[PDB]
């Protein structure tokens, strides 16, 4: 029997347009300028005068607000809103002009890049627990893996844990004492919690006939991105972008959060060069959140 | 120097790296051989540092 | 607070030259040293504050009368500033000096049984800081050369790693390595970050502000020595000297 | 939309021309560059730098041109003269001018 | 009669007793404060096209000018903190830092190290036991939420009981189903989805009846003095870098999957009052520890 | 019969047609070039207080200037040779980099791209036929050093003949014993330790008598023509590095220990003489790969 | 059943934990510096009438100036070089060198001391363990190229487990006649000469037949963080010339070939980390030593 995350299996392609310096440039142009159109908002609402928000929105958007018309945000906006779009499946069409992106990147200047910096995703990757026979195995859960199990047979059975090789650390607890340990090690007492670096290799867990037990799993993972990277702005963008169906596209897979989407792309073959792109759409949600919020439309 | 990225202190003491240029220079003349590029020039005017 | 604020190898072996071991005896009953007891914090909390009482501290405990206990009352003096409770020492013995009872055979104290792992458990060595772990390192050392058991100091420094690298670094028979050393061993001092006259939570922390603070008043006081300003008014014997060197050495 | 005779100014400065990508030099690496007459035969873009510019626009037609040359080269190093455009509106049918 | 325990509360291990008076204290708000600035330098960096913002930044808390030759660590703060945070952790760590370098540290801002001017809401769920008669089987699982899964196989319904310390503020209970909980000694109520709870005041009964299994969700608010500069969220991501980095591989410790959870199960220990104290002083350590880590990664 | 051949001499797998124009040659000379400068200027900058020389070094070799927030990989240099040094390796490599690329980069210094200047001396021993009567037993080891070990069980004694190609100058056979070896249709010399052999000359035979085993230990030397500026210390680790970094995982290809065993095979194919002079040219590459990691390490 | 392991990697020694602070770094690279430059001083003035270069850097490296009738030993640098090393080498050694003394030496030339900016490659071969059946045989031989002779008395082929740690990065098996290698649970492949192996990948099984030994020949990639400054040459030859001149002899210690040896063994202890860092600045001091011990002989 073999039991797997939900969230890891068949990650989609990613798209593979708008990925050189000049495009990078221009994600990390519209975070800036994006975030400095939030802070004006709060300035404005709070004094009487709305000049800063004015100014704000006239360097994102090219045009003066105005009362009558509704404030869509400009070309800036719709240029965002597509490139989002072409990251996350290769099938979605990459339509914006590159004359176009380069001439939005051009309205600042940004010093960094996108491996200036690391964060931590804490999806736990569970590719396979191998379970003898009269053993019932079943994972529920992402952010905390919940691996419950219990056997029929009249033995103790050995369950094999395999966390992959690309997490860092993984922390397991359980229900009651349980028994791990590496392949041909001896076992050691019980305890209720272990920690784990997944390249030691395949984890045995031994189970006592009588009753069940629950293993409760959490990993850290970190992947480098840029120094402006907010992972609580990038989770409000995934989900407003998912609500706005920008990522509605035939033969893609969708994920519960951008925790699991990177973790997934990761997890796969080519998952080094997938990921890099992904980096780059975390940018481009973290921008689309502030902007939204300050325009809702 | 009026560089931007050079920001080096160059001792005025001593036999002046320019001096050397002259000389260097006229060597080359006799030779036929190219004069000093802008890249040798930078590196031998830059030899007497604080 | 004279022999926490020495901040030199020199400064601290001079002033065990000229303290008799009577400082550090205490004369005061004090309570038993290792107990789980429940004190008043009150600036922090309503509800008493747990915690557990130690040798290293700036109040007496009751110490044993054995050679051993003798030899932690005067590492807690160096560390923590008061001594233990040591019932009927012999007069020929109080008035000796620390620095002899550490370094002589002229006293009649027999040391070359004793362990160093012990004594490090003993006077909890878990919880001291650095300057203090220094400190008993130069008693352990004195202790091995009087006695010859410079080999039980070497195996005692190699089984504890970060002992072994702060370890002070001089040749308890030799004031030219004395002189070199670059160490800082004060516990108190002038503080460069701002200091208040709150209280702290351990036992051990609340004892040594209490000498934190008395020795910036002491600093204020006019028993403090200025050198800079009075130096022709000092004694010869105490005047700063680059020739000044212990009895022997 | 200005109408400018040999308009200097471009919307954005075109990362391809031609669909050929246009060569990118800092100037800390144009200044130490010796065959700058062979880079020049297919132009550069000079960036990391602050270019000041001034310009005249002049209502009548002429010759849209520049005060003075753009190179200018020492043992040193390479650098670019002050820029300042006498900028003509244009007439599209002036064959002089075209010719010029 | 089973006994089923919370799996993080079991073995606290003793923390380190260092670097807690004021003058350390006074150390890592510097160098939160300092790595604030850091990190802020990096925007203010973009506003312009130059280095200065970072390269002033950097000198103030590197005691040295960045250098394009080597990979920027962080000068003798760096150290300084990354060793400070081992000694939090358990007491067998040593104390490596002097107290000269740190008072020397503490002079570069002033600010005043008061840790008690403030307070956190910490959600962890502390179950210090559940007792279950012979035919029941009672299943703990999680931390932030608590899964309670309980089943009756005997022929009458069951009474559970439910201690959840003497140290979390409110507890609210949510059930698959209605069920009745009543506190000792006082009448069963009926049947509701929700219950709200003060630990303080006794021991839970919970009336299992003979059926499908009853599962009930537990969640916990407790709350903890600390500084005005906490940021729990600043605070969970450092945790989980010097986990990654190492900095808690001490022997005869015990490993906890976030900073809510250390923190709970060193106060239901003995004399759980005096760690939380330290553990507090960690997360501000922590916090810097995040900051400055990300601005320069090693 | 018997047939033992040694390892790396089998199907050595065919090299790259791309990047052997006299431009290309150019931008590999001058890449090892500017690839040498990054290590004296890194050098210079460390006995100076000043990285004035580096920054003047990265930014001639990446046409960027340094800065403190980037990742300084190297630029467009870096990664032009990244990618010649994959399609030099196997015919199946993409060879992405453009030609205008090429020649734009070789521009950055005068250098010539001549290859057959001077001279090197490779020590692997090319053993690449030992036939050997049926009772006996005979096997191959070690390449820079290769130790035959024979063993016969017959009655009589066993004639083996060893073929070591037309391509090796010279090669210096030793044995543990004193045993007897000559030419085809040629009288036996008496025993004696050490042989000079030119492997042209034609194939040897070698007595070997009933009885403790005979080891021969062969050493050999080939002379290829090599750049001037040719370092051997520094393409074994540039070798190392590479395969390490993964830019020879490529399909269907051969891998090898050390650049010498991979110079040597290729040399022994049927197509020896152009394939050879494309792998100095990798050789060359590779030694500008080594400088410039180790001073920008990734 | 039958467990082999390579000699040099059985119990590795502690190393020294004294001279490891940012002034010691210092003083080591000073004394590189100043060592290369009495190399280059000393051949200068022999290629010269005069005397004055090698006066002026003697001077420098010994702080007293040269004379005739006398040993030119080094000065004081050259005692706290040969002290420093003897520390370093373990733990047992005593540290006697004052830290004034380090510090005033570490002032006559300017350098960072950095000891990470770079890597080295080293070419020692970890085979951790090599597990065989009962009627099997297996031998190891060597540290730079591991010859594995293995043979099956044995009726049926038998599965010989390889295990190659997960500190090396790349290691490659050339095998005498062509043998099948795959990893655990994984279909073996058709008999190859030759496998490029990443360690990380797992145990590997190796099937053995019944007709001739098979000899497998190693050679593993290891990269180790060390300053630009690090010269394997030199280094190699610094260890040669301790070792000879009784820097090494103490008690309670073992003793290695070569220096990779050394640093391969010492990374794959428990704590491998922390000894590398130390024996990295063992490295340069070792590579000083033979600088100034061969213009200065004693």
Request: proline fraction near 4%; aromatic fraction near 10%.
């Amino acid at each position: 029997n073999r039991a797997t995350s939900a969230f890891l299996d068949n990650p989609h392609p990613v798209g593979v347009n708008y990925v050189d310096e000049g495009s990078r440039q221009f994600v990390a142009v519209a975070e800036l300028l994006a975030s400095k159109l939030i802070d004006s908002s709060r300035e404005s609402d709070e004094s009487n005068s709305d000049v800063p928000f004015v100014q704000a929105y006239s360097k994102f958007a090219d045009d003066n607000p105005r009362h009558l018309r509704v404030k869509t945000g400009g070309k800036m906006a719709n240029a965002l809103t597509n490139v989002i779009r072409s990251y996350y499946s290769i099938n979605a069409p990459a339509i914006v002009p590159q004359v176009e992106i380069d001439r939005l990147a051009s309205k600042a200047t940004v010093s960094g890049d996108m491996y200036n910096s690391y964060a931590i995703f804490n999806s736990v990757p569970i590719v396979e627990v191998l379970s003898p026979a009269r053993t019932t195995v079943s994972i529920v859960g992402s952010d905390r893996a919940d691996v419950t199990m219990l056997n029929t047979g009249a033995g103790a059975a050995n369950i094999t844990f395999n966390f992959g090789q690309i997490a860092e650390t993984v922390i397991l607890k359980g229900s009651v004492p349980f028994q791990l340990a590496r392949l041909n090690q001896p076992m050691p007492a019980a305890r209720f919690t272990y920690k784990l670096r997944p390249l030691d290799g395949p984890f045995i867990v031994v189970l006592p006939v009588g009753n069940p037990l629950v293993i409760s799993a959490t990993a850290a993972t970190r992947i480098q991105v840029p120094l402006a990277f907010n992972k609580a702005l990038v989770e409000s963008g995934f989900q407003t972008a998912m609500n706005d169906g920008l990522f509605d596209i035939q033969n893609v897979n969708y994920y519960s959060s951008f925790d699991e989407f990177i973790i997934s792309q990761y997890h796969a073959q080519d998952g080094i060069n997938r990921v890099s792109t992904c980096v780059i759409l975390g940018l481009a949600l973290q921008a689309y959140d502030q902007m939204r919020r300050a325009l809702p439309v | 120097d009026t560089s931007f990225i050079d920001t080096r202190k160059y001792c005025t003491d001593g036999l002046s790296p320019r001096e050397i240029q002259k000389a260097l220079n006229r060597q080359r003349a006799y030779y036929d051989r190219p004069e000093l590029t802008i890249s040798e020039n930078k590196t031998l005017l830059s030899q007497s540092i604080i | 607070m004279d022999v926490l604020s020495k901040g030199s190898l020199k400064e601290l072996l001079a002033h065990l030259e000229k303290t008799p071991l009577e400082e550090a005896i205490s004369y005061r009953i004090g309570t038993v040293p290792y107990q789980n007891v429940l004190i008043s914090r009150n600036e922090y909390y309503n509800q008493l504050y747990p915690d557990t009482t130690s040798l290293i501290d700036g109040v007496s405990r009751e110490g044993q009368r054995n050679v051993n206990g003798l030899i932690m009352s005067i590492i807690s003096y160096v560390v923590s500033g008061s001594g233990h409770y040591i019932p009927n020492i012999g007069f020929m013995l109080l008035r000796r000096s620390i620095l002899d009872i550490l370094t002589k055979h002229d006293t009649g104290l027999v040391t070359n049984n004793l362990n160093y792992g012990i004594i490090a458990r003993n006077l909890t060595v878990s919880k001291m800081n650095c300057e203090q772990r220094k400190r008993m390192l130069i008693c352990f050392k004195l202790l091995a050369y009087k006695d010859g058991n410079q080999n039980d100091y070497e195996i005692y420094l190699n089984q504890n790693i970060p002992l072994k690298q702060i370890a002070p670094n001089f040749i308890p028979g030799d004031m030219r390595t004395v002189i070199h050393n670059q160490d800082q061993l004060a516990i108190v001092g002038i503080p460069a970050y701002r200091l208040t006259q709150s209280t702290e939570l351990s036992i051990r922390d609340d004892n040594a502000k209490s000498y934190k603070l008395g020795y910036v008043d002491w600093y204020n006081s006019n028993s403090f020595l200025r050198e800079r300003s009075e130096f022709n008014l000092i004694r010869l014997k105490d005047r700063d000297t680059k020739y000044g060197k212990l009895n022997g050495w | 939309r200005f109408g400018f005779r040999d308009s200097p100014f471009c919307t954005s400065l075109p990362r391809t021309i031609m669909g050929n990508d246009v060569r990118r030099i800092s100037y800390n690496v144009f200044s130490m560059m010796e065959d700058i007459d062979d880079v020049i035969s297919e132009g550069f873009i000079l960036y990391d730098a602050y270019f000041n510019f001034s310009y005249d626009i002049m209502t009548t037609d002429g010759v849209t041109r520049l005060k003075e040359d753009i190179l200018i080269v020492t043992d040193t190093g390479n650098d670019i003269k002050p820029i300042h455009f006498y900028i003509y509106f244009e007439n599209r049918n002036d064959k002089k001018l075209r010719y010029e």
